[model samples]
Target: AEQYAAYKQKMQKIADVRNAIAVLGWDQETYLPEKGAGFRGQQITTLSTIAHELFTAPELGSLLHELHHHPELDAVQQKNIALSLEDYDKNKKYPASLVAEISEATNQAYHAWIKARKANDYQVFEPALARMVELKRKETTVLGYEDHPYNALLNEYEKGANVDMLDTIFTEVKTALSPLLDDIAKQTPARRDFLHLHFDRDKQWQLGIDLLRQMGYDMSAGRQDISEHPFTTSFNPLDVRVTTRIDENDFSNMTWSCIHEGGHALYEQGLPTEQYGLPCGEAASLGIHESQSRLWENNVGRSLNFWKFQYPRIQALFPEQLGNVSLQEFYKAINHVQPSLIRTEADEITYHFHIMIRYEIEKGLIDGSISTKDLNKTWNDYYRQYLHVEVPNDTQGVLQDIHWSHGSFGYFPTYSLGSFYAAQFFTTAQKQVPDLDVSIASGNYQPLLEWLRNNIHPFGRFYTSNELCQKITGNPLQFSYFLDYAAGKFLRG
Candidate 1:
């Protein structure tokens, strides 16, 4: 027991260093001065190097090796040691030099992405992106895989995920969603010009904060900030932070972003704080993490039931802008299915196509079939073919997402996967909690929140994502649930 406690203390120290790096990252994106980018990158790289070195140190390895066989430890303790061992073995694959190189390179790539987006020029970011791709390719070789090099990268974000499986999933998505999108396009388009009306920034901020509170995000434990790209980051369960970007001319941007990020904040806040620094304290996978956000953003925030109370409150806030828009009109407006350029602003039915395009491109990039020079053309081609949207420039096309800047090769597919999982989970939630929609419509989310708390948030990574899904919903991820959800929304009488 004493030895196990000592091992836990060591893990916490590594966690502290990593969390400090997270703080620096959050600040870099949120409030860091323009002049600070150079040293900020270096500072983060230095800390990342140190943390990697510490986590992969010989002492930690030796301790984990001994503790792996410690029969006195309970299931949770044993599981922690087992997970730590797996991570240690993986970390040992990279030398401290490689860690430092990737860390520094990630920062450079991020800044280059920002510059490229601002200038609307892919040329400015091409070299950094190409370099990062090469580094990531090298990493795949180091982390060894059987079927495809991309599989090595995929497992980083989603355990047990591989190219073959994701390809099939995307195929399923296209088969299920393409016809629905066509059906939506043929309908009289919903009145959405009102969504483009100029909304006050201050009022928008206050409304966002109010919605966050309504979703049960703890303002005392977490706070919101403004950023170029919205994201959620956590230092600990007790100190989570979220950020959003608001466009004064577009009312649609702020509301959904707040709800999306608020959902992520709720997950962070619900994580077992007592299990901090352990795998049990963390989320299952990026796929599951994204499921929480999508579940709230789409299943709740976009639902007619949620807007029953919400639209009235929002109309009160921006009376002149939304006062004349009927609830039925507003609901269809937000849920309107149309091919769009921006993935974040895309309608629900066409959103999966966006993920499919990214998945195919990422697979091509990893398999050495595509290069950075070809990125813009390939991206534009996919958009035109898949969603029938013409790309005007690199900013609206190839350089839109921040994922590639951070060398996140396998992350995009999870957006689609999460929505699928969200639908499945919500279906089960509705069946178990009678009047779930009624409660949401009545502005009482506690019953639904409590249901998620009991079933999902508390388990952490005790189960793999598939196992968790089966446990909760009586089956693993099925694309049919999401298909059914889309049918209900788009095919309503």
Candidate 2:
């Protein structure tokens, strides 16, 4: 018992440092004054190194090794130690110097990304990005992989994720979604011009808060802010935060972002506080995490059933903009399908194409088939080929996403996985929970939220993504669920 408590104490201290770093990173994105960037980077790096030292300390290693199969420990304790040992072993792979170097570069590349976005130039970002990529390539060798170097990066974000499964999944994406897009192409799109009308910024903020509250996000546990991009950050089960960008002219932006980031917050808030600072307290996987957000964003937020009750409030809020529009029109407009430059704003149906482009680019970049020098041109070429859209400049094309700049190389594939898993999970939810749409239509999400709380959020990494999917939905993660969903929603009788 004493030894186990020692392991837990050490783990919690490491978590404290890491969450403190998250608080700083969140501040860095939200409002860390301009001149503070340089010092802030150093601050974050110092904390990151501190967390690394705590995790990799020989004492923690000895404790984890000693507690491996302690019969007195419960199942949760056993799994906690087992997972912590695995994590410690992995952390042992990288030298402290490399950890500090990567942390510093992450800060540099992120700041450079902001500068590049504002200047509409990729050159400002390229040097730092190239450095980050080189370091990431070094990371691949450090982590090791079965077949592909990128697989090592993939596994870091999601266990058991590899080129083999992604190739199969993406190949299915191309084959299945292409036909759905072809069919959607021949049809007239929803009238979405009103969605671009001027929506009062304050009103938009209020509506976002209401929607998040309606979705059962505990306001006391979390709050909202604004950033250059929309995201959700969790400090712990008790405190989660979401940031959304407001485009005063674009009404669709804030609404779904509120729900999307709220979805993430709910999952974070739903994690077992009793398991604090353990693997079970963290998210199951990025893909699973993204699934939570996308499920709320697309499956529930975009559904006609949702707007039935909510659109009246929106119309009341911006009666001048939406009063003339019917619920069908409002629903159809929000669900409109099109290929676009920004992945975040891309309609649900075409979003996978955006992810596939990044997946291909990242895989190539890691494998040496693609170089970073002309990455802008390469990005433009891929957009042109896949989405059938021409890229005019850097901010709209290569620089649109903050992932690469933040050193999130193998993360893009998970967005598509989020959509696919959301379908399967939602399908299961609708089956398990009676009158699911009935509840959504009334804007009462208790049934759905409770369902998710019971099924998804608590276990965290105790189960792998596929294992969790199979247990909940009675099937492994399958593309057909999303394909069928797209066809049914986008196509007519």
Candidate 3:
């Protein structure tokens, strides 16, 4: 018990540091002064270095090692220690210098990416990205993988994920989506020109807040802000925050972004508060984390049932625009399946192709087959081949995504994986929760919220993504569920 307490205290200190970093980063993205970027990056790297040192200290390692054999701790305690120790072993592999180096370089890369995006030039970002890629390659060597170096990177985001599995998933993607695309090509798209009408930014922001409130996000414990990219961050569950991007000319941007990020915030808010510093307080994996966002964003937000309640209110808000558009047309408009240049704004069906493109490029990047010098052409070519969308320029193409700048390799695959998991999980929820669509149609989201809290939110990393999926659905992750969902939505017409 004493050893466990000591371990917990040590973990809490590390958590404090990390959460502080998150706060600073959240500010950096949302409200930090332009002049603050340089010092903020240094400050973040310094804290990151300090946390690394404290976490990788021999005493902490020894304590965790000792607690592994202790029988008195409960299952959650045991699991936390086990996971922390696994992380300790992994952390031990990388030198403190390397950790600090990566942190500093990641900071630089982020700024460089911002500059590149503003300039609409990939050249400015290429060198920094190349350095990051090189560092990641070294990271793969340090982590050590049997089959592929990219496997090490993949494991960072989703445990047990690798090239072979992703390749099969993408192969299934091509086969299943080919027909859907052909069918979609044959139909006339719903006239969604109204979606591009100038929406009042303040009113749009207010609507986002209202929707989040209806979805049961605790506004007192969290707040929303604007950012270049919409994202969620947690200082802890009690202090979760979401940032969204609003386009005055595009109504779809903020609505879905809010729902997407609100979904992420809900997951954070639902995490066990008492376990704040422990592994069980953390999300299961990036894939599972993405599933929460995608679940709400796609399954709930885009549902005909959801907009059934929402459309009237939205029309009331934008009576000049949506007053003429019926709910059926709006529903079809929002779910429009067509190839697009932007991955984030892509329709549900073509979204996977975007992920597949990135996954393929990521694999090639790590495997030495693809170089940064040719990345622009390669990115454009893949969009052409997969989505049949012509890339206009770097800003709308390669620079569109913020992941590479943030040193988030091996992360894109999780978006597709998460969407697939979201379908399976949502299906299970509908079966378990009585008349869930009926409740959603009435804007009574508490049932679904409670259901998610019961099944998914509390467990955290206590189970793997696969384990959680099987536990909830009585089956492991399957792509068929997502395909069925797509067909029901797309081919129904």
Candidate 4:
């Protein structure tokens, strides 16, 4: 108990440092001046260095080992110590300087990546990315590995994940999605041209705000704002925030982004406030976290009943843009599956393929099988391979994501896994709450929110990925649920 107490406080201190960096990132995306980016990188590196030092300190290791031997500890305590120690041992071989270098590189490279992405210049971002791959290779060696060095890196985000497992799942998913996509391709296109029509930014912002509020977003506790990259963060339950990017040229960008980020906000708001700074307060893992976001964003928010309630409000906001479009037509249009350059805008069926391409390329990059200069060719080649779609340019292809520049190697696969998790859980949930559609139609989410809060939100890291998957599905995460949904949605679209 004493070991946990000490470790908890120290870990919370590290979390606080990272939390400050998150706030800085939010400001950078929303309002920080371009000139402030360099200084902001230095500031983030300073904090990151401090946090990494504290995390890797020998004292923390000693305490963790002591806690592991304590048999009287409860289930949550035992699991936390076990997992933390696993992470500790994995990194124990790496010198602190290596971490600091990677941290600093991540800080500077992120800003550079942003500029390059916006300018559509992969050349500007390439060398930094090449160095990033080299550092990641060193990182994998430091962490050690049994089969694939990439496995060492991937496990940090998704426990037990690796190249082999992901490939198998992706292969199955691609097989499942191809026929459905071909069927949609044969059908006449939906009236999605209506969504592409201009809707005023000011009106779109108001629509986003109204939808978040309707989804139980508390403006007083969690504010909504505009950002270049849509994200959600919480300093505390009372300080949670979700932001969206409003494209004046199109409104679905704002609408669905709000719904997605709102899903993340709900998890933050659902935290057990009494368990703050503990495993019980955090999400189970990145995969589970994405499930929460995807569940609301795609499953509920895009559902027929959801639009039945919100479409009228949106029409009122942009009467000139959408006054005549029927809800049926609008739903059909939004659900239309088309291969697109932007992953965020891709329809549900094709979205995982986008993530899978990135995940595969990330493995190659981390394992030294591919160089940064080769990324453009490798990236586009895979898109054509898996999705049968051509990537037009750097902006639409390899430069679209901020993840690699920020040292997020293992994160992309979770986006696909989350969709599977969402579908698996939601099908069972809809069975539990038979009137779920009626509730969404009336713009009420309490019942669905309550179910998630009870099932998934409160436990947090109390459950491992495998345990949580079993708890939700009564078996394990299966690719079938997601494929079926994609098949049905696209076949009908």
Candidate 5:
């Protein structure tokens, strides 16, 4: 018992060091002065290396090995040791010098990405991206994978992920979605020009706040700010933060993204505070985390039931824009299926194509088959082939997502997996919770939120996404659930 206490103390100290970097990251992204960018990166790197050292120390390793066999620990305590030891082993595998390089390069790439987006050119970001990719290639060897280098990167975000598994999943996205797109194209499109109308910036910000408040997000425990890219970052469960950017004229940009980020924050806030720094304190996986957000964004936020309760309040708020818009019309407008350039702005059903394109591009890049040079051209080609849209600039094409710049290589597939998981999760919720749809229609998500709290949130990383999915749904993750949900939403008269 005393030895376990010491281990927790050490782990909490490590978490303190790690969370300092997360705080700095959020600050730099939100409120840092422009000139601080250079030194800020060095600050983060130094902290990262220190954390690495602290985690990989021989003393910690010895303690972990001893605790791994201890008989007095509880089940949860044992799992914490098991997961912490696994992570400690992974950290030990990394060279300290390489860790600092990745940290510094990630900062350089993030700034270069912002600048490139500003200039509307890929050249500005190419060098930094190439360097980041090179460092990640080294990381693959360090981590050691069976067949593919990308598998190493995938395992960082999602355990048990491999090229072969994703290859099958994305193929289904193509074969299944291609015909659905044709069917949607045959149907008449809904009017979304009302969504593109001028809405005052301050007014839009207030509505975003309103949505978060109504979503049951605790304002005292968390706060939101405006950032170039919308994201959620957490220092701890109680001190989570979310940020969003507003488009004064485009109502759609602010509306759904607000809910999306809130959903993310909700999950972070729901994490067990007692677990603190351990693996069980964190999310199950990136895929599972995305499932929480997209479930709210699409399954709940975009649904007819959600809007039946939500649209009246919005029409009252911006009566000039939505006063004449009927509930039926608003539902169809938000649900309108169309292929688009931006992933975040993509329609619910067509969003997987965006993820699939990145998946293909990332696989090639990690395998050394794709180079950063003229990668812009490859991006445009993929978009044309998949979405049938012409990419006129790098901003809307290759430079769109911030993940690559942040050195997150294997993240795109999780966004796809999220939608698949969400459909299954929501389907289970509907059947399990009596009057679930009626509750949503009545502007109450307490039942749904309680379902997630009981079924999903409390466990954290104790279960893998697969285990969590089956435990909740009584079946493994299935594409048919999402396909059926899409057909029901889009194909029904």
Candidate 6:
């Protein structure tokens, strides 16, 4: 316990620095002006280098030496300490110089990426990207792995994830998704002009706040803002923020993104804040984090019951744009499955397919099979084959995302994993909470929040993603839950 206390105190200061970085990141994405990009990179790089040192310090190694295999710790404490030490061990392998190099390169790459994206010039970002790839390769070599270098990278976001597992899952899902896309291929894009039929930003803002409150994002503890990528961040449970980009051309895009990011905010807001600096205070993994976002964004927020509760408020706010549209038509339009350029804007049915494409590209890039020059061609090939859509240019095509430019090589597959977890968890929750819709329709989510809090949130890093999924859903990760959910939604529509 004394060792745990010391660990917590050291981590508290560490977490404060981490939280500050998060704020910087949030500002960067949301409101940071273009001119501030260089300064932001320097600040982030400095903070991140310090964090790497703090995270991998020998002092932590000694704490792990004392606490390893200690039987006195509970399952949660054991898990927390276990992961902390595991991270300490793996990260310790990298020299401090290597750590600083990665941070600085990644930090600079962040700015280069923004500028390139803004300019819509892949050429502008290519050099920085090459350097990042080289560093990542060196990182994988230093970290050491059995088969694929990317496997080691994946473990950072998702413990126990390997290229082998991803390859299997992606192959299976692509087969299932292809046939469905073929069927929908005959259907024309929904006119859905009603969505762009002119709604006030102030009204839209009110509706977002209303939905967040109904979803149990505490106004006192959580907030929402506009951002390019649409994300959620937390300094602690005491202060979490959700963000989204408003597409005046399509309300569903903004609404769903808000709900998705709101789920993440709620998870952070629900985290055991009293645990503070301990692992119990943080998210378990990127996949687990995505699970929370996808659950609310898709399984719950996009459901008929969800709209039943909020459609009236939306009509009241923008009576002209949506008032004439039947709720059924509105639902079908938003739920329509079709190919899209933007991954975030892709429907639930086709969303994972987009993720799979990214996964394959990341695997190839990391394994030395694919080069930066070949990425655009490979990306286009997947889009045409999987979704039968063509990307017209780099902006809407290969250069669409900020992930690769910023060195997030092995993170995409986790989105699919999260979708699976959400579907299964919702199915389980339905069995437990028979009147779940009544609570939703009445503008209350405390019951569902309470269920998630008890079943999911507090565990922190107590278990690997696989272990946590199996515990929550009564099965290891399965594509069936997601496939079934998507199938039923499309058919019902």
Query: Which ranges of candidate 4 are over 4 A from the true structure?
Result: 1-3, 33-38, 96-131, 365-373
Tell me the tens digit of each residue's lDDT in model 2 across 360-479. 989988988888898999999988877889999998999988899889989888888888999889988999998898999997999999999999999978888989999998888999
Q: Write the per-residue lDDT of candidate 5 for residues 142-206, one digit (tens) a residue.
A: 99998999999988888878898889888988988989998999997677899888888988899
Listed in order, each prediction's TM-score against the native is: 0.92, 0.92, 0.93, 0.90, 0.91, 0.91
lDDT of 6 by residue, 1-493 (tens): 8987888777888888898999999899888999999999999989988987787778888987788768998877776787677767876688989988988899788888888878877777777887888899888888777789998888767888898888888887888878877767766666577876766777777777777887788879877888877878888888998887776666876777878888888788878876787776678888888889888987888777777877787878888788788877787777777778889668887887899888888787788898877567788898888877898877888788877766787778888888888888887887778787687766667888888988888777666778887887788888878778877877544
lDDT of 4 by residue, 321-364 (tens): 88989998998888877777789768888887798788778877
Better of 1 and 3 by TM-score: 3
Error of 5 at 301 (Å): 0.2
| Reference-based lDDT, residue 375, model 1 | 84
**lDDT per residue, candidate 3, 119-189, as tens digits?**
98899999999999998898999999978899999999898788988888899999999788989999985
Q: lDDT (CA) for every model shown?
A: 0.88, 0.89, 0.92, 0.82, 0.90, 0.81
Best by lDDT: 3
Question: How well is each residue in 78-117 modelled by candidate 1, as lDDT tens digits?
Answer: 8888888988899788877777888888989999999999
Model 6 / residue 81 / CA error / Å: 2.0
Span of ten consecutive residues with least summed lDDT in model 5: 188-197
In model 1, the Cα lDDT at residue 19 comes to: 96
Q: For candidate 3, which ten residues in a row score worst on lDDT?
A: 95-104
lDDT of 5: 0.90
Candidate RMSDs in Å, in order, are 2.5, 2.6, 2.4, 2.9, 2.6, 2.7
Score candidate 4 by TM-score against the native.
Answer: 0.90
- Which stretches of model 2 miss by more than 4 angstroms? 29-41, 95-135
- Each candidate's number of clashing pairs is 0, 0, 0, 0, 0, 0
- In candidate 3, the residue pairs with backbone N, CA or C atoms under 3 Å apart (3 or more residues apart, or in different chains) clash, namely none
**Residue 359 of model 5, lDDT score:** 92
